[PDB]
Amino acid sequence: GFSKTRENLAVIDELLLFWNLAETDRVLDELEEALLVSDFGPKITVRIVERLREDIMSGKLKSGSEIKDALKESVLEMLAKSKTELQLGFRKPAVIMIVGVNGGGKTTSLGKLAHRLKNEGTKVLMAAGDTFRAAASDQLEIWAERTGCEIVVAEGDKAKAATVLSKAVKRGKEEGYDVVLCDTSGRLHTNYSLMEELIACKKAVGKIVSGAPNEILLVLDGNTGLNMLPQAREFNEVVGITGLILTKLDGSARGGCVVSVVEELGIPVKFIGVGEAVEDLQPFDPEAFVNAIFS
């Protein structure tokens, strides 16, 4: 879990061992390099390091360990200015939409999240709202069966996503479900009016339970997340994103990208994907994360 990042950032500890006032510029240049090699973006590394330099000059930081602590809390302040928990409220069912470009991990993140909720006694219905392919619903159907979830699939091939999602949330209300988890399409052709279809899913579920969707989670591959930020912002601006799922961070040496996307999007990360097994979805805790990568 970011163990590669922790190993790379550990050179900051060795550096700070021998810091003194005179060695400040050397230490920071080389702190900056360690943050940059991890995926801390240029804009925030400069702010972190310039904040450290201001606080060393004004005497607020007088030892290697104080500098290390201030680094950690400067990063924490950029992660957590925002709640990272799912807020499902009390009206039933709660509705969670998983959105994002195909390839990124929506369907697998959905099933892993369903497995967590079922471990918690939550009764979960899955909605196969990616109607592009038959194989998308069959893939989701595989997840519904090894997690104990019933699943609502489309009736015909030309079915709208909103149609399936509305049927599914209607069904979830009636059968006594706590949560309906909605898979959606992420067609990268995007001459497909993806945004439009997502807005129609949003309205369709809101007419069945006012307040739904309680969460719209944007799935972003953690390795290529810094690239598609324009696409992320479009999801957030047009649909409205309540949280991020950063996937494929298995043993990431790129832990800074978490900080960077959060800083740049202003959307909390709620879960990290760290592998392909059903349990490889971990809730995101900013303090635990900052401890994870800086020990």
Ligand SMILES: Nc1nc2c(ncn2[C@@H]2O[C@H](COP(=O)(O)OP(=O)(O)O)[C@@H](OP(=O)(O)OP(=O)(O)O)[C@H]2O)c(=O)[nH]1
């Ligand atoms: N290592 C790692 N891999 C992840 C993670 N999340 C998703 N993957 C993988 O990315 C691929 C795409 O996931 P999907 O869930 O189908 O993506 P999508 O719905 O957004 O289109 C899957 O593997 P696939 O090869 O495309 O298909 P399959 O493995 O399910 O057969 C899935 O296993 C993660 O956190 N860590």
Ligand SMILES: [Mg+2]
């Ligand atoms: Mg999918």
